[PDB]
Symmetry: C2
Subunit: 77 residues, 2 copies
């Protein structure tokens, strides 16, 4: 699988293409299953494009899963 | 704390300076405590300079902790 910790959203990539890429790489990694979701969330925050990073930090505290953040972002495009 | 998933060894940084930087950022993150060590190991493998990446993958299967990998690398300089 790809090096998950190297995955960033590039300037010709959408957020969802980066999320899909990232998640596939995390799932193929040696991380424990319980580590996957928190890693994915941190990488969403840190490795998306700046405008998306800024949108993610507006999300309510009740949205905690990767899927909730994906929907939050996509539904605001 | 710093964005752990953005931390890479730069060309004027030693491995240990990167490990220390990385580990401080991981410890200050919201990751669950059990996720820290596997994240650190993956980032050692993925985010160090190529020569160090190549040295790390020679390590025996018995070396599993961050500290064991740090000693492995430093003791071979």
């Amino acid at each position: 699988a790809g090096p998950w910790a190297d995955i960033m959203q590039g300037p010709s990539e959408s957020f969802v293409d980066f999320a899909n890429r990232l998640i596939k790489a995390v799932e193929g990694s040696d991380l424990p299953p319980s580590a996957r979701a928190p890693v994915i969330i941190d990488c969403f925050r840190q490795k998306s494009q700046p405008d998306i990073q800024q949108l993610i930090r507006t999300a309510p505290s009740t949205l905690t899963t990767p899927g909730e953040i994906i929907k939050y972002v996509l539904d605001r495009q």
